[PDB]
Amino acid sequence: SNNSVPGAPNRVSFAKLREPLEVPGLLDVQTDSFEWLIGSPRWRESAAERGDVNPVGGLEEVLYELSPIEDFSGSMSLSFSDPRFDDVKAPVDECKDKDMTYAAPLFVTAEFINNNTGEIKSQTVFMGDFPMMTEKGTFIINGTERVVVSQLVRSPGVYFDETIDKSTDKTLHSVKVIPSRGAWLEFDVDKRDTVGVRIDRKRRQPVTVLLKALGWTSEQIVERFGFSEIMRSTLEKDNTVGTDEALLDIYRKLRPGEPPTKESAQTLLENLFFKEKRYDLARVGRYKVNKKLGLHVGEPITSSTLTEEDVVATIEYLVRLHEGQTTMTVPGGVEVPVETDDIDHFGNRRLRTVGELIQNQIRVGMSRMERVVRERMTTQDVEAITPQTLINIRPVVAAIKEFFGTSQLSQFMDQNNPLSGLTHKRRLSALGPGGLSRERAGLEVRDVHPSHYGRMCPIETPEGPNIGLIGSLSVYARVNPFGFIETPYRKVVDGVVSDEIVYLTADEEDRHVVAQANSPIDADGRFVEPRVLVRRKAGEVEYVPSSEVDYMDVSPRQMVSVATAMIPFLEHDDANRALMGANMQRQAVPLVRSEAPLVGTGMELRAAIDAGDVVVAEESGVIEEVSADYITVMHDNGTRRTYRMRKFARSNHGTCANQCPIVDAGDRVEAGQVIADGPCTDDGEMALGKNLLVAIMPWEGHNYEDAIILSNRLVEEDVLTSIHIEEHEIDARDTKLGAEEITRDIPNISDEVLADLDERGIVRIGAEVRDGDILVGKVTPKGETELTPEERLLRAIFGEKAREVRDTSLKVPHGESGKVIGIRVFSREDEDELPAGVNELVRVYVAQKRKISDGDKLAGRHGNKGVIGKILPVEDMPFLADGTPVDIILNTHGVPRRMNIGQILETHLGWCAHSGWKVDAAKGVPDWAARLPDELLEAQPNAIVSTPVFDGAQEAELQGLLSCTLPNRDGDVLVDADGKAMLFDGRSGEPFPYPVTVGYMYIMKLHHLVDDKIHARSTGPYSMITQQPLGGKAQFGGQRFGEMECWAMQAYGAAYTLQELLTIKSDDTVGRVKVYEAIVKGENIPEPGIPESFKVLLKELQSLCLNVEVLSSDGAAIELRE
Amino acid sequence: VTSIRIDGVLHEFTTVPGVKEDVTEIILNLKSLVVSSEEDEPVTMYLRKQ
Amino acid sequence: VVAAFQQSGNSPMGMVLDAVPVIPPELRPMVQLDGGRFATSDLNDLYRRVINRNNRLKRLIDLGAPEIIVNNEKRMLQESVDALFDNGRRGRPVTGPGNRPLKSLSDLLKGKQGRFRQNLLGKRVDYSGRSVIVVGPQLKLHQCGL
Amino acid sequence: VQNRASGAEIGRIPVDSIYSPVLKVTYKVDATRVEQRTDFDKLILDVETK
Amino acid sequence: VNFFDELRIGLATAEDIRQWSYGEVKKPETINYRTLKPEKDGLFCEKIFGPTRDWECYCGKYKRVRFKGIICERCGVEVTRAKVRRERMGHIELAAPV
Ligand SMILES: [Zn+2]
């Protein structure tokens, strides 16, 4: 019915029929921006459909802006235009495998013109390899999949700030004109009722100075401002009249110490304020100013800088606002409201996506290249110059290579599961280059503004220190061409709801009236109640008669992100816990064999199918050959296609990315139907955890304070085992004493150690390894004497080798284990591109099948995290009357405090879904079944259901369902009307005195595993510089002993323990060996020595010429030499 | 069962040509096999098909 | 000042140096990376800068140089030693390429990253371990699982 | 993994094992508790295996 | 740690500095570019500070642990543990008081 994806499993849902439109392509934010950048024809036709004219792409824009290039003489002219792209060099798969980027060549036709000769020359120019976004929105660099996240930046334009004086308590109004690029220019009003102007953060001089520098006369200024006396009083304090006077005064003020001239100040003032070369806004700036001042609304975008009319208009705006004027029309314009501009209002914060960022980097690179070409244009002679010798592509390629490699907006893709990547692609970040730092942000730029409704999701946000700065785009939001964020709406004319959908920005939503989508409506298309709830400007909400409501929203889930749209019963949970619930699905771990959840919210199907990690058939056909590695399908016309599937490939965070077919041979399929589910997917739906039978009761203290008790059945049937794949990399470079070589003959190592290697020197595939075992044998020559180039060349001509080696092999780090599954070997002599200086590079992959145990972290969907506390045997768990022991026991002291009551509801519904229900239809449908759709009247056992957020199952319906459930195979009803059941204690035997809550719950498995945290050390490697033990876990290091522990030890009066923890354990180079020998021999521990830190301090002091010596008790001198 | 050997394979995390399911699922299915025995020594069975 | 000088017992000659000591090598490491770029401490640069001018003065004394040039070089040597003991104490500080302020000897103590604090409060010890904790209710009050 | 320590050939794949044949067990008690010396418990034990 | 019941600081005179050091430094260069080894009388000279490799000299006459505390005649280095490279100091004789 409501499903649009072919072949998907049916999922009956509690809902009220809502279908103006379906969820848009969830990745259009990352895709259409780049499409516009390269100007692909699809973007062109989409723009033509939208109604706009003059289709110009980002590259075309920057190139037309750059053209033309001339010297000071103007004899020679150059220009570029019409950029074109070609086919990609190689498909994505080998780009991942061969560690080569995914690029396409870029060509531009360039023409050079010389006026004196009158001759032109045009030819094609290659300008590097432009990176290309794949089908899934992720760029590929050097074999790693990187993603570029959008940014939130203050929009260029004019802002009218208001302030209230401390003493006079008058309403002052200041203006600021923030440009895209140039020098700042703003107007100020003080308590003296004087109007002044500041340029480039200089002092205050009256705007009368600017008005006279415009060349205007006093009479004209009087006529323009004859309705205001504050302006007249401000002009009264003028120093002198005269255009030259204003020009010279401005020249002296801006640039003291410079010569005055009549003809100079005009030139530099014009350059600074009205010339595109130096000062320039953007398209958005002109659009915003035109919208604010309402001048030439139909004027197409031609200029991109200030006009005198703009300054006059903003002066009029300021003077009218300072005297409390309401409505203002600049002459020849239209009437617009007058009000202050909110700083963080979402009509002023602009979303610069990937396209604009890449365009900015391109503009910088071509600016550098244009500097170079201008420098080298005059140097060489005219008749012997061609553009090929004029353009050096070095800066452009350097810039586009550096931005990806370093800039804080090109981040590694998070590939824990499809949801993580999908949410990572749509993230909006307020930090980054050109934006405010972490310490610049205050409490005004973090909390939700009322204009976020429908644009930025207010619930999803990292819980760390970055809170508020990082947000997620809403479900239905799309970005307008300029960079603002639009939302859909329905058109309501007069109590009549239409199916036309109109997209609105922030300001249009401000200027109208809008109503919620859950307000009752009649089937004919009319409102029922006279007074409906309506949101209005400044966040006010009130009741209003139905005869003037402009717009009605689309769906109840219009304000939530994608991540938070997958939480059932979202409206029953507190916002604080919902944040943690939404921030834990981005941390799940794909399991060996996944299961679809019993109670979902319907969003997961679209989420999975747009995440791109599930292979979807492109064109209809039938299945010819289906095998675990590939699927072959013949189209209708007879053409064939073969889809290959990735098996056991490493993700970024160590998990496994595995794909399996679901279809079988001879099965007719339709275009768009899923055929091979990826990781964390079952039957094309986002599955992240399992369905566990849970009970809610404290239990003899093993689940005290957020612990969880699990049954051993989970470990038995491997319900929760995952797979982790680590990678190890070694590389042999060319030393100055010779050359390292992968060899099987390690110096003086017994063969039992070297049993598992082949002749090459690489561990055979499939041999289980352990810490301290050799993976790749390597030898590096010993520095006995530098080899003279004569002997080295003599031996290299005949290809000779000598016996001077020391072992530097690769061993499994402390803690790892598993089986080797794949070995990649790269060599320079085999025409493979490598970094300079190296010859052979070996990557060895070690895979291990983990299980669940103590310390592992589990979590439900509603942010009820916890840690495993004890894994009881199967017979110890309490069991129902039937005899099926529960799989997990929660705790009840944690529900009322956190107010995540929603999980309880879900638990009940889970059981109703598991055993199936059959409502009695005799004597008609009951009262509580009136609104319930007829699809849910009967259900088979373990049949999945849905529950959209801010809609869906109601308390009465659920209560009715709990009383009409089917019996089991033995004609018994295990649970009661309230939802509880009569458990039996399995440890003793007696039944529990009171019934307990039991149900089914969807439980995930977070990625904080114990086996990568447990760590121990008694005596291992020491650092060679500081004589302290190494750090980290892979280095077999020790634990930091912070100063707070030092205070805590001093508090007890403990002295010997502190001295020992600081002397013979850490950096007493003689004491440590002595204590080891004493312990291993059984004698008393000798006295501590003296730490190396103190001797270092003494040497540093003596190196400053300060004679420091250590005296004895009486006064006799002592030396610490030895 | 306690151990299996498959011709043409070395470890579990891989696949074999001509089979719709890789080795991991084969092991997972073979786990729930029901076998009854009385000899006190590790006995061996075979399974081949084409 | 003067009473302290008299009573303590100390030759004021310490205020004028004729033999500048040289810190050991290990406290100024010079490490060759695999990338071919020699990680060089700044102390080596300062020592080299001093020694060049000292040798030039030694060469100019025995060649009968005129008074003005030897005076200039003596001034330069004094400035070089002053930079060695404490960079940035006077005028334009000595800086390496990239406008990096060089680390002098006195920057081994002064500042939070100095020796007197940074390396003296906080250490890494042996015989230690770390793991995730879990509530266990069958223990007496003075026991811990391991 | 209790079986991988044998150090046998590279082809053998260790596999978990569930030796227990019993699948489900439950019980009920019928109590004759009328106040006399005639109080007793009848135990009904239900067993299902594989 | 022993009995350092007092610790006194004081100005160091030229005689004290001449007493501490184990030779003067005369070559401004730091380390040989090609040999990758320090040069004699340079900033890492083995004659002053000590041996770069334990129980060895530049010429390698006494390369064995048997000797201890004795100085080779050809190269004039002292055979002890490499740890001493963290202790010994040099000095520079100025030609004009500073
Ligand atoms: Zn020697």
UniProtKB/Swiss-Prot annotation, chain A:
PROSITE patterns (UniProt xref): RNA_POL_BETA
One Pfam short name: RNA_pol_Rpb2_45
GO biological process: DNA-templated transcription; response to antibiotic
An annotated GO cellular component: DNA-directed RNA polymerase complex
Function: DNA-dependent RNA polymerase catalyzes the transcription of DNA into RNA using the four ribonucleoside triphosphates as substrates.
Quaternary structure, from the entry: The RNAP catalytic core consists of 2 alpha, 1 beta, 1 beta' and 1 omega subunit. When a sigma factor is associated with the core the holoenzyme is formed, which can initiate transcription.
Name used for this protein in its record: DNA-directed RNA polymerase subunit beta
From Swiss-Prot, chain B:
Chain coiled-coil ranges: none
Origin superkingdom: Bacteria
Family affiliation: Belongs to the RNA polymerase alpha chain family.
Function text: DNA-dependent RNA polymerase catalyzes the transcription of DNA into RNA using the four ribonucleoside triphosphates as substrates.
Subunit structure: Homodimer. The RNAP catalytic core consists of 2 alpha, 1 beta, 1 beta' and 1 omega subunit. When a sigma factor is associated with the core the holoenzyme is formed, which can initiate transcription.
Domain notes per entry: The N-terminal domain is essential for RNAP assembly and basal transcription, whereas the C-terminal domain is involved in interaction with transcriptional regulators and with upstream promoter elements.
Record's protein name: DNA-directed RNA polymerase subunit alpha
Swiss-Prot record, chain C:
Lineage: Bacteria, Bacillati, Actinomycetota, Actinomycetes, Mycobacteriales
Organism expressing this protein natively: Mycobacterium tuberculosis (strain ATCC 25618 / H37Rv)
Description of how the protein assembles with itself and partners: The RNAP catalytic core consists of 2 alpha, 1 beta, 1 beta' and 1 omega subunit. When a sigma factor is associated with the core the holoenzyme is formed, which can initiate transcription.
Up-regulation conditions: 6-fold repressed by starvation.
Coiled coil: none
Name of the molecule in the record: DNA-directed RNA polymerase subunit beta'
Top-rank lineage group of the source organism: Bacteria
Family in the record: Belongs to the RNA polymerase beta' chain family.
Described function: DNA-dependent RNA polymerase catalyzes the transcription of DNA into RNA using the four ribonucleoside triphosphates as substrates.
